């Protein structure tokens, strides 16, 4: 059974968590380049492509629990650190000098080569987990809630509040930073609409309108050119909204409210379509809560429904 699935910074990897272990798997191209035999694990993220995970348990166990985080080595096989805390871990987020955990009402910042307690924040209550942490050193931002849908900008690196975004007027369902920490994209629970921010100057940029009727958006990534935002939702329809809406979209082939998370690619890719053709595209990727992994092919230039590349499975 699969608990857990999530990309790395760059979208390159995916960071697996099952009843029976965790798994790394390459993207491009696909195939499992790592495997662990353990307990049921809740959560696992990655640090980029490096050897360093972050691991939560599911379940009380021996060695394993939601309140706990164990810090691994994959080569030297070993434990680097193991931290408790008082309650269950909703999120764990990493980048190359902070490493962040969330609570239902705190947030923990650790240096990440000491693994030492920098900053700790006092938050309302955050059930749904919503986080992000910026993959970029030079600009280390934090966002997160703070109930309406305002959005807290926290610098990582000064560990200082910087901005408070009024980005909807109901709660937040999803939340996204740019892998230069220079944008953010936000939705609510309406799910009607989405919006595009400048972190340091706290501008709305963009705002596209996804639908008429509400619904429950999971998920949104920018490609790492900045180009584009895309979102997938409760309709399993994806969109992808050019920063410059309805540039382009596509059709998750899976039930209604089957939750998905979202990612882009950061190369763009000469494949061979369907009286054959080469396009080069940009390559989405889809993970299902059922654990499919489905590859669709963006036109840049065109855009349009993507077609399917390749579906590929974890468990």
Same mark, same amino acid.
């Given at each position: 059974?699969?608990?857990?699935?999530?990309?790395?910074?760059?979208?390159?990897?995916?960071?697996?968590?099952?009843?029976?272990?965790?798994?790394?798997?390459?993207?491009?191209?696909?195939?499992?380049?790592?495997?662990?035999?353990?307990?049921?694990?809740?959560?696992? &993220?990655?640090?980029?492509?490096?050897?360093?995970?972050?691991?939560?348990?599911?379940?009380?166990?021996?060695?394993?629990?939601?309140?706990?985080?164990?810090?691994?080595?994959?080569?030297?096989?070993?434990?680097?650190?193991?931290?408790?805390? =008082?309650?269950?871990?909703?999120?764990?987020?990493?980048?190359?000098?902070?490493?962040?955990?969330?609570?239902?009402?705190?947030?923990?910042?650790?240096?990440?080569?000491?693994?030492?307690?920098?900053?700790?924040?006092?938050?309302?209550?955050?059930?749904?987990?919503?986080?992000?942490?910026?993959?970029?050193?030079?600009?280390?931002?934090?966002?997160? =809630?703070?109930?309406?849908?305002?959005?807290?900008?926290?610098?990582?690196?000064?560990?200082? =509040?910087?901005? !408070?975004?009024?980005? %909807?007027?109901?709660?937040?369902?999803?939340?996204?930073?740019?892998?230069?920490?220079?944008?953010?994209?936000?939705?609510?629970?309406?799910?009607?609409?989405?919006?595009?921010?400048?972190?340091?100057?706290?501008?709305?940029?963009?705002?596209?309108?996804?639908?008429?009727?509400?619904?429950?958006?999971?998920?949104?990534?920018?490609?790492?050119?900045?180009?584009?935002?895309?979102?997938?939702?409760?309709?399993?329809?994806?969109?992808?909204?050019?920063?410059?809406? %309805?540039?382009?979209?596509?059709? !998750?082939?899976?039930?209604? &409210?089957?939750?998905?998370?979202?990612? !882009?690619?950061?190369?763009?890719?000469?494949?061979?379509?369907?009286?054959?053709?080469?396009?080069?595209?940009?390559?989405?990727?889809?993970?299902?809560?059922?654990?499919?992994?489905?590859?669709?092919?963006?036109?840049?230039?065109?855009?349009?429904?993507?077609?399917?590349?390749?579906?590929?499975?974890?468990?």
């Amino acid at each position: 059974n699969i608990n857990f699935a999530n990309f790395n910074q760059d979208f390159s990897c995916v960071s697996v968590g099952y009843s029976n272990g965790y798994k790394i798997y390459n993207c491009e191209p696909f195939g499992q380049c790592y495997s662990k035999s353990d307990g049921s694990i809740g959560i696992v &993220e990655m640090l980029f492509s490096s050897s360093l995970l972050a691991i939560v348990g599911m379940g009380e166990q021996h060695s394993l629990s939601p309140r706990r985080l164990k810090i691994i080595n994959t080569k030297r096989q070993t434990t680097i650190c193991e931290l408790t805390f =008082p309650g269950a871990i909703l999120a764990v987020k990493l980048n190359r000098e902070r490493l962040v955990v969330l609570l239902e009402e705190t947030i923990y910042i650790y240096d990440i080569n000491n693994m030492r307690l920098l900053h700790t924040i006092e938050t309302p209550s955050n059930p749904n987990g919503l986080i992000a942490l910026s993959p970029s050193s030079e600009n280390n931002y934090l966002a997160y =809630p703070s109930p309406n849908g305002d959005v807290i900008i926290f610098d990582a690196k000064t560990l200082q =509040p910087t901005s !408070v975004i009024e980005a %909807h007027r109901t709660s937040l369902a999803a939340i996204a930073l740019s892998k230069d920490g220079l944008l953010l994209a936000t939705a609510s629970d309406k799910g009607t609409i989405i919006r595009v921010f400048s972190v340091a100057t706290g501008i709305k940029l963009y705002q596209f309108r996804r639908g008429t009727y509400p619904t429950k958006i999971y998920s949104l990534a920018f490609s790492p050119d900045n180009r584009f935002v895309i979102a997938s939702s409760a309709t399993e329809t994806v969109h992808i909204f050019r920063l410059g809406r %309805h540039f382009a979209s596509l059709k !998750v082939p899976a039930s209604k &409210e089957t939750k998905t998370v979202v990612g !882009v690619g950061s190369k763009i890719w000469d494949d061979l379509i369907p009286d054959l053709v080469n396009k080069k595209l940009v390559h989405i990727m889809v993970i299902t809560s059922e654990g499919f992994f489905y590859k669709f092919g963006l036109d840049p230039e065109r855009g349009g429904d993507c077609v399917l590349l390749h579906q590929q499975s974890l468990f």
